Write a protein that binds this ligand. Structure first.
Ligand SMILES: OC[C@H]1O[C@@](CO)(O[C@H]2O[C@H](CO)[C@@H](O)[C@H](O)[C@H]2O[C@H]2O[C@H](CO)[C@@H](O)[C@H](O)[C@H]2O)[C@@H](O)[C@@H]1O
Ligand SMILES: OC[C@H]1O[C@@](CO)(O[C@H]2O[C@H](CO)[C@@H](O)[C@H](O)[C@H]2O[C@H]2O[C@H](CO)[C@@H](O)[C@H](O)[C@H]2O)[C@@H](O)[C@@H]1O
Ligand code: UDP
Ligand code: UDP
Lengths: 343, 343
């Protein structure tokens, strides 16, 4: 009973066939909002698949499109189209970060910003200047700047029904890594953990330009092909098989993780998570039940021996209980309600 | 008699102590507008030196500042500052490129955009969408998108008086290269010309992140220390001594050059330019008088024999005649009048 604009990043399709976190959350939120009878306009790439109105400034995902060199050009096209049409919307829900803040002061339609990223020494200064806007965080640990006007915390979610549940892991045990090959995700940690426990590690993910040196130096020399396997970038079925077959997923971050969608994807498949307790991991993992919070590699190494005891079905039930689209979209509805009323 | 906003890039100080083309043009334009009684607000780094109003979102030039990783944050900070105060100005003069186009449709004060860059396969798409805006080209050959509403072509200018004139080049002859060490400027070409003419080459310029590989592979292995010299980025006095002492400046571009300030800087010192006839070279160099338009390495080599034959003093007068601050600022004043009238 509202007109809602969803402004997504253009790096990935909505929803992404493989890598993509925000575009996934935007897809789930958008589709469910439309089902609830709202007039939704999706601002996303041209190959996106939505039942809402799709306005696109480029036909394809930009990350893997070979003809595009300047992503910022089409980002600016998107924001120009959105805020030029402000009075065609009751609320604008932006997922593109700080690039939308100077536009918000120039239009009358209220804008809601879901923060999907880490606060940095630089972006804090632009967020500071626009602190009295309606931000929504995806985890409590993310709120490192309290002077911002957080309307609410709305945890992310996945479509649990679409993830196949695995009752028992693969007959010869192996560990899984799923994520972009970045130091922030610590795949080098994951490689050390598997070698010291003696259990193989299967890796999947992208290696975009910023991590090529890191992959060339720390990761690639260790990809054995037998004990350390790497299947670059995985679509939904491939990733669902990878975590499901594993006894546990290594999530050894070295970085203030905003949320970590792979964790709830692992648990949804029934595979618990051995993670280091940084950022949102303590809020996502229930220690000793759906996984194990660790503070060191050895803590993670020791925890892998206590992984078989966990109830794998409890992991899936846990994801259903707190990380469902039903709850997320309802919480996002509460946000729109508040923003339109407390203006 | 107008209130004018000057929106500069933040990579370099206004004025730049060393490298910096666009930031230099903004200085001469800003100071001269103030002298003519305009209420000018300059948006640039906090260490800028202006007699106009200085609004800064970061205190220093960002290119060499080690604490900044996200330039787009402060660019957005600046663009937010300008258009939030749009009705404090009669005209906004933007030099930051396409990132300001979506703002122009959202504010009431008319905006004039000076194009300082090359049209790209990507950036063409955002300019097309905003073609009915007030663009100003710095050369006619730059107008690769004719469908834009060009108000006028306004060639750039330099402060000729600040460049010392050199009547006779250095006693043992040498060739000069001045520019960013980029393939677009073809410094490797200049080295091919050096050995074929038998005259040494003195090189000056920056090597920023994008051209470090280009530098290590194509340029650096050839730096003798005697025949090929590189003095890593030069401030104003050093670069003027570099050009003045040279018999000619090599400008072997490989790229649709928007203008090329080093060309009128070389001539200002009295040094003619051996350039490849791409982009703005035919409009900046008077062939056979202040330099030589060339079409290959061999065509440049042949021109070096005909360089001691040109009048060096005619070069300085040429820059005074067409590329003076007086002429540029008056033409930009005419542009301001037209934009305010044909609104
Ligand atoms: O401060 C580190 C900075 O890295 C970010 C930039 O916002 O990572 C994104 O950009 C890099 C490009 O180098 C990508 O490797 C990375 O996948 C990006 O992650 C974000 O952008 C994707 C595309 O939309 C989303 O799918 C993803 O959900 C999102 O995390 C940030 O992580 C961080 O701010
Ligand atoms: O189309 C090529 C693309 O290269 C640009 C990037 O926008 O070059 C600028 O940024 C590169 C680094 O990638 C620098 O080497 C270069 O100095 C830059 O040139 C422009 O930006 C400076 C800072 O404002 C100006 O001082 C300079 O005069 C200007 O040419 C662009 O040239 C272009 O878009
Ligand atoms: O090979 C991969 C690697 C990642 N993803 C997905 O892209 C999203 C990544 O989100 P996450 O929060 O876990 O990491 P980040 O956003 O910080 O890159 C998740 O849905 C992953 O399942 C994927 O499909 N394939
Ligand atoms: O060591 C250097 C190298 C370059 N420049 C200046 O950087 C500017 C570059 O302008 P130009 O148009 O010639 O090249 P571009 O803008 O495309 O980089 C010129 O004023 C140069 O004088 C400089 O001062 N010192």
């Amino acid at each position: 009973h509202m007109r809602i604009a969803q402004v997504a990043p253009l790096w990935e399709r909505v929803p992404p066939p493989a890598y993509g976190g925000v575009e996934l959350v935007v897809s789930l939120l958008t589709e469910e909002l439309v089902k609830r009878g709202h007039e939704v306009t999706l601002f996303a790439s041209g190959d996106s698949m939505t039942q809402a109105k799709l306005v696109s400034t480029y036909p394809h995902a930009i990350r893997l499109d070979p003809n595009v060199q300047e992503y910022a050009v089409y980002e600016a096209l998107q924001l120009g189209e959105v805020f030029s049409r402000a009075n065609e919307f009751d609320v604008i829900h932006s997922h593109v970060g700080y690039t939308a803040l100077p536009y918000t002061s120039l239009v009358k339609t209220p804008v809601v910003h879901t923060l999907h990223g880490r606060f940095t020494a630089d972006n804090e200064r632009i967020f500071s200047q626009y602190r009295n806007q309606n931000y929504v965080s995806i985890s409590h640990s993310q709120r490192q700047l309290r002077e911002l006007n957080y309307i609410a915390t709305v945890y992310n979610a996945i479509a649990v029904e679409t993830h196949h549940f695995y009752p028992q892991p693969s007959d010869p045990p192996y560990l899984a890594f799923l994520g972009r090959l970045s130091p922030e995700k610590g795949p080098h940690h994951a490689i050390e953990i598997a070698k010291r426990v003696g259990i193989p590690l299967r890796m999947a993910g992208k290696v975009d330009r910023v991590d090529r040196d890191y992959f060339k130096e720390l990761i690639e020399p260790h990809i054995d092909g037998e004990f350390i396997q790497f299947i670059g970038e995985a679509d939904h079925p491939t990733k669902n098989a990878l975590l499901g077959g594993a006894i546990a997923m290594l999530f050894p971050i070295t970085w203030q993780e905003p949320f970590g969608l792979v964790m709830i994807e692992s648990m949804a498949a029934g595979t618990p998570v051995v993670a280091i307790a940084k950022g949102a991991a303590p809020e996502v993992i229930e220690h000793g039940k759906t996984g194990f919070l660790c503070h060191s590699v050895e803590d993670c190494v020791a925890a892998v021996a206590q992984v078989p005891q966990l109830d794998r079905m409890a992991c899936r039930d846990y994801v259903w209980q707190r990380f469902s689209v039903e709850r997320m979209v309802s919480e996002y509805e509460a946000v729109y309600d508040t923003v339109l009323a407390n203006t």
